[PDB]
């Protein structure tokens, strides 16, 4: 019997990760920061799955609350005694929209094009301003929430769950990341060098990168300090997550710990734009959660590479 914990599972990709893992016979701990949303999600998913009540368990979990993190570990130890799969899916964007919310999607599409060009050898991300009558506002509070949810959350939950995962015969961690964490998009040369220097990577060095970023946005210095012009907190947080994925895979060599991009999928975070359904997106993290023993660890996989792994 295998047990999987999925964070941010009341909606979006995380909800579908729960569906797909439960369909594979894994006992799923569906977690969410809001109790009512998570209980309702469990009820809906249990109905749709049409399976026995024991297949899907709810527990509260806010990945930014250290008490909540500790209590979920106590719960798993008492009820199940081990954990086999951790999916760090919860995430936020750090952006507030003013006006036409579809500007958010315009930025995503611009960024995908920029990434493709940079991966093909171009040396700069083109400036971009949107067409529609909206704007993405990126303030300190949202940036802090993004880093704490998207980077410290997976780090702290991983750390809290090591003892339980160590009791699995095939421990798996999947970090739902983004191709926008690419160092090519990070702008900050110091941070790119630190995160890119894999042999010297430590948790302390990654923490320093994200804390320097937060101080800069607090002080209104994002441009002058060479951070991204937009999606700054998202990019920093996913880059940091990718780096922590490598750190953790090295520290816990018997585990398989990987980061993925699920693809651009219609969820609340994207204002329900993007080519993929939530069910399609969840195929990616589920693929890495079910990776056979001996498979890659410490890697970042975009969607098509993840799905081709086996
Ligand atoms: N959709 C895409 O195109 C896309 C692409 C690449 C990567 N991703 C990643 O996919 C992940 C899932 O996002 P989504 O697209 O499914 O968006 P979503 O529909 O907004 O779902 C986000 C989930 O994260 C939960 N969450 C936020 N803060 C949390 C916290 N502190 N503690 C616990 N749960 C928290 C949210 O709960 P509430 O309901 O309480 O807010 C929600 O359940 C994210 O990490 C995102 O970065 C998405
Ligand atoms: C990393 C990133 C996100 C989460 O994956 C979006 C899709 C919410 C906006 C673009 C930057």
Residue numbers in the entry: 5 to 314
Task: Quote the original article.
A key difference in the sequences between the ketoreductases and IPR was a substitution of the highly conserved catalytic Tyr residue for Glu (238 in IPR). We determined crystal structures of both MNMR and IPR, the latter in combination with NADP+, alkene 3 a, and β‐cyclocitral (non‐substrate).
The IPR–β‐cyclocitral co‐crystal structure shows the ligand binds in a non‐active conformation compared to 3 a binding.
